[PDB]
Design a protein around this ligand. Structure first.
Ligand SMILES: [Fe+2]
Ligand SMILES: [Fe+2]
Ligand SMILES: [Fe+2]
Ligand SMILES: [Fe+2]
Lengths: 307, 307, 307, 307
C-alpha cells in the first residue's frame, strides 16, 4: 500500500474442462459465478468481496495461470505506477476497459520470473454477496461447499528472484514480510506484503519460469478447515497435504487439486505484520519446518508438482 | 494509511492502584511488563507486538485515558503530519524523545471530542515476546492468563464527531469503515480504519467530552474467548458482556473491567475492509442489534458506564 | 444402565400452532420430519439418531410436556421394570404398540414431581439420517439450521424431589451425577445420569408440579453454538440467555424459545461421569454461578419462565 | 457395562528410559505423576479422572504393554466376572491388593490375542485433580503441555480376533460398536465399547500376539488437537500422522511416539453409540478411507510400527 496497490484483485487460470472446473469452484469452493464472456470465460467471486469478480476461468489445452491482477486506489496511482514501470524498463501492455467484462483498464507487465501481473483502478462494485448494505447480517444463508471468504494470495515458482524483488519493492510498493535464506544469505523465497497480511504474493526460486505453485482462498477458522477436508473426502477431490500449519506465516492450511491439476490452498489465520517490522527469517536448514511446521519434513510433491 | 499512519502504538490509562491493576493486566490479560520510569509508570506489551510497549499504566486519583498514540511509517511522515495539523489550525504539542521511556518524540494534539491523540515515528524495537527471530515458533511457551495477542483499538465517547471525522479522515488519513446514522441521516457513530481492520479507533456521540468507553485487546479464536470468560469468572473479575457478537464489525466480544473500573474488551474475528469499500451502515432503529447481534437489545452499563 | 434403561427415547411437546412450531423445529434446529399421525401429531428426529423419531409435536390449547420416554435394552428389561413400578406401588398405564406411530408398547407413569415418564423396549430402527450403513461419511450433506445432533435431556421443575429421587434411582436404575444443596443440606436440584452423561434428566424444586423448564438438543462444538446464535438473530427467535457456560455439568449452552413459548436449549461439551464418581455438589449461596458460570448471577426468565 | 465393566482403568507400559518417559508423559502430555513404588514403577493420571492413577510406567529394556485393566462397578461384579472367567475355561491370575500401590485386588487373564487384561473394583478415590469437590471450576490452573483429559482407550494388534470377540462380548459384557470386514465377510477388526464410547478397546488382525499399536488420551476440541500439534513440533517429538480424521469412529486424531517408541494418540469427538445400535461396517476395499478419512490412503508406519 506504499505506492497505492491495495490487494490481489483477480487471477485468470487455465482449465482443461470448464464444466469440471465449475463443479469444483462453485460446488466445493463455494465461489459465486457472476458473468460469462464473448470468449467463453466464466467470472467468479467470493462472498465477502465487494467487487464483481476475483477468479476468471478460461478453457485451454494446458492448466496454469494467465495473469494475476492487483487493484490500486485510483487512476492517479494507476498512471503513476504505469509510468514508473515503463521508467524502470518494464515493457508494459495497456489493456482496455471491457476486455475483461466489468473491469476497468489494466496495465499488464511481465515479471522477470516469467509471470504476468496486472494493475487496475476500476472494477464493478456489486457489494458483498447475499447481504444488504444497511443493517447486514453476519453472513448469507445459502453459501455452498467451503464458502471461501476471499481470494487471498498465490505462490509462484520463478527464475530471477533478485530482479523480481526489486520490481515489487521499488516500483510497486510491496514490502518484504517473510524470507528464507541459505548459508550465504541468499533469498530462496520471498513473501511480499501489501498491507498487514503475511503475504499478498510470494515467489520461491525455480529453474523454469512462469510456474504457479498454488492459488489460495481465505477460510475463517480451524474448524472451517476440518469441514473443508471432510468435503474433500466426501467429493473425492485430490488432497496434497491435509490440515496442518505452515512454518512460514504460521497459518493453518490444506492443499488440494482441481480437475485440471491446478493446486488450490484454503487457509486461515496466520501472523500479521506492518511495514516497520523486520522480515521474519527462516533458514534453508529448516526448510522442512519452514513449509511443514508439524512434520518438519518436505512433501516430495510439494516441490515437484506445479502447473 | 493514506498519510502514512499505520496503527495505534500505545495508550496511557489512569488507574487507582498500580498493584491491583498490574495483577489484572499481567495475570488476567497476560500482558508483559517491560519497563518502569521515575514517574512511577509501568510499561507493558503483547507478545505478537514488535515494539517495547503498547500500554503504559499510571497511578492517578481517577481512572480514564490520558492519550492514545499512533505510530507512523517514518520520520518524513511525522514532519508532514505535524505541519498539516498546524495548517488545519490544530494546536500541536511537542513531546521530546525520552519523556516516555524508550519512545521517540511525539506530536500530541486534542481532537474536538476532548481526547488527546499523538503520532510518533519510532519506539524501541524488541521484537516479538519470547520468540526467536530465525525459524520462529508458532507461539511463546510461558504465557499467563488470556495471553492477549495485541492492543487492538479503543472506542471514545465524545462531543464533536463531525469535526473529529474531518480531522481523522482529512489530515490524519484514516477512512470511514462503518457508521450508524439516525433518522435524519445524521452520523451518530463512526468507526475509522487505517488499512484492513474494521476500525483502529472509533467515536460515539456523547454530550460530555473526553470519555473512554473501552480499550480492546485482540484474541485469536472464538474458543479463546470462551477461555477468557472462564478466567474472568475464575479470578472473579467484573464482566459487562459475556461471549457474544456485535452487529457492527461482526466481531465476537466480551466486555469486563479492571480494578480501577476501566472497561477492557477482549475480542476476535471481525470483518475486514479496504479503502475502496463502501461504509457499512447501521441505523438507530436497529441500534440494539447494531451493538448486540444476538440479543438485539441494549445494555444499561454498555451505553452509560464510561471513564 | 443399572436396570437396562439406556437413554431419552422421545418427548411429546404441546405446541400452539403446528406450522410455526415446525418452522422452528425443522428450519431452525434442523430436525427431520419423519412421520405424521392420523390425528395431526407430527414426528421428528435428529440425524445422528438411529431410531425413527425423538420429538413429537401436537397442537393443544397450551404448551408444555405431555410425556418423556426412555428406551430400555430389551422386552425383558421392560417387563421387570413394569413389575417393579407396580410392586413399588405405582399406577402404571400400558399403551399398546402402534398407539404412537412406528413405536412399540409403552409403560407410562407419572412421577411424584407431577411429570409423566414412560418406558418402551423398541421403535422402528432407521439408521443415521442421510448416511450409508457401510463406509459412512462423517456427516449428511443437506442439514438445515443448527443441525442438532440429538435430543439430549430435559429439565423438569417439580414438587417431590426426594420421592422422585428414590423412584429414579432405586427403581429405574439412574444415579445422580450432580446436585445442589441448600443451607440446611437439603437437595434442591438433582441431575440424574444413566451412564456417562452429566445428566439424562434433571429436576429442580418448584412449588407447582408438572412444569417443563426446557428440552435440550446436542450441538457438537462451541463454534456451532456460535452459528446457532447467529441463526437465532437472522430468524428473529426469542433468545433467553446467550453463549455461556453452566457451573453444573460445565456445558456450553444457549436458551431460546419455540413459537409456543416452550424453551429450547442447545448445548455442547458438559462433563462426563461414571457410576463410581461422587456427585459433584454446588451450594445455594453459589447458585448464580451454578447456573451461569461466566456471569455468576441468575436471570428473570431462567427461574420465572416455565411451561 | 452389560455385566459391570465400566471403563478402562489403567495400562502399564514398558519404557526404555524412565527419565525420558516421564518428560514425554508429564511435560508434553500433561499427565500428573501421582506415585512411585519399590520396583521403580511410576504412577500417573489425567486430571478429569477421579481415581489415583491410570498410567503406570515401568522401566524395562523392551517397549510395549504389560497389561490393560478395566474398573468394574463393585466387588460383587468382580467376583461374578472372576467366576464366569473360570467357568469359561480361562486360567485366571489373582493379584493381591497392594500389588499396585493404592489399588485393590485384580483378576488378570490373557486374551486369545495374547494381550493381558485385568478387572478390579477398588482404587484409592482421589477426585479430579486440582479442583475442590464443592463448586468446582471448569478446569485446574496449572495443566502442562497438551493437558490430556483422560486415558481413553487402546488399540491392539492381535491374532485370535473371533475367540477374543466372544470372550469380551460373552463374558465381559462389551458390545461391537464398529467393525471392518473383508470380501469374505471376515471381520478383520472389531471396535468394542462398554457404554457409549465408540470404543473402549479394539483389535486389528495381525499375525502376532500381544502387540500394542497405541494407547490413547482424550483431548476436548479440534483446536486442542492443533495446540498439541504445535507442541509436538516445538518439543521435537516424532509425529506419526498429523491432525486428521478417522473413517472408523470419525474422531479427529494425531498419532505420535514416546521416547521408547510406543505410539501415543490424542483425539477428540468420535461417534457415540448405545447397545441397540447396529455395528457400523467398513469394508476392506475402503480400508484406506476407513483409517484415514481425508487422505484415503494407508501410511506405511501405521500398519507396520508396533508395540
Ligand atoms: Fe499459501
Ligand atoms: Fe471495541
Ligand atoms: Fe440443560
Ligand atoms: Fe484410537
Amino acid at each position: 500500500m506504499n505506492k497505492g496497490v491495495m490487494r490481489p484483485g483477480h487471477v485468470q487460470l487455465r482449465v482443461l474442462d470448464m464444466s469440471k472446473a465449475l463443479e469444483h469452484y462453485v460446488e466445493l469452493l463455494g465461489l459465486i459465478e457472476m458473468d460469462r464472456d464473448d470468449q467463453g470465460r466464466v467470472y467468479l467471486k467470493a462472498w465477502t468481496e465487494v467487487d464483481k469478480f476475483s477468479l476468471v476461468l478460461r478453457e485451454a489445452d494446458e492448466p496454469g495461470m494467465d495473469f494475476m491482477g492487483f487493484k490500486v486506489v485510483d487512476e492517479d496511482a494507476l498512471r503513476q505506477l504505469e509510468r514508473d514501470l515503463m521508467a524502470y524498463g518494464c515493457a508494459v501492455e495497456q489493456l482496455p476497459a471491457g476486455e475483461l467484462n466489468s473491469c476497468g483498464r489494466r496495465v499488464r507487465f511481465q515479471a522477470p520470473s516469467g509471470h504476468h501481473f496486472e494493475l487496475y483502478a476500476d472494477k464493478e462494485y456489486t457489494g458483498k454477496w447475499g447481504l444488504n448494505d444497511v443493517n447486514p447480517e453476519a453472513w448469507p444463508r445459502d453459501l455452498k461447499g467451503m464458502a471461501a471468504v476471499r481470494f487471498d494470495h498465490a505462490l509462484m515458482y520463478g527464475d530471477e528472484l533478485p530482479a523480481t524483488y526489486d520490481l515489487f519493492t521499488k516500483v510497486l510498493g510491496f514490502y518484504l514480510a517473510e524470507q528464507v535464506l541459505d548459508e550465504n544469505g541468499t533469498r530462496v523465497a520471498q513473501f511480499l506484503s501489501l498491507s498487514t497480511k503475511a503475504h499478498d504474493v510470494a515467489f520461491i526460486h525455480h529453474p523454469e519460469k512462469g510456474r504457479l505453485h498454488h492459488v489460495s482462498f481465505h477460510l475463517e477458522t480451524w474448524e472451517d478447515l476440518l469441514r473443508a477436508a471432510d468435503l474433500i473426502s466426501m467429493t473425492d477431490t485430490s488432497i496434497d497435504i491435509g490440515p496442518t500449519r505452515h512454518g512460514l506465516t504460521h497459518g493453518k492450511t490444506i492443499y488440494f487439486f482441481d480437475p485440471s491439476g491446478n493446486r488450490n490452498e484454503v487457509f486461515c489465520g496466520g501472523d500479521y505484520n506492518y511495514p516497520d517490522h523486520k522480515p521474519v527469517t527462516w533458514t534453508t536448514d529448516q526448510l522442512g519446518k519452514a513449509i511443514f511446521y508439524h512434520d518438519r519434513i518436505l512433501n516430495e510433491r510439494f516441490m515437484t508438482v506445479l502447473t
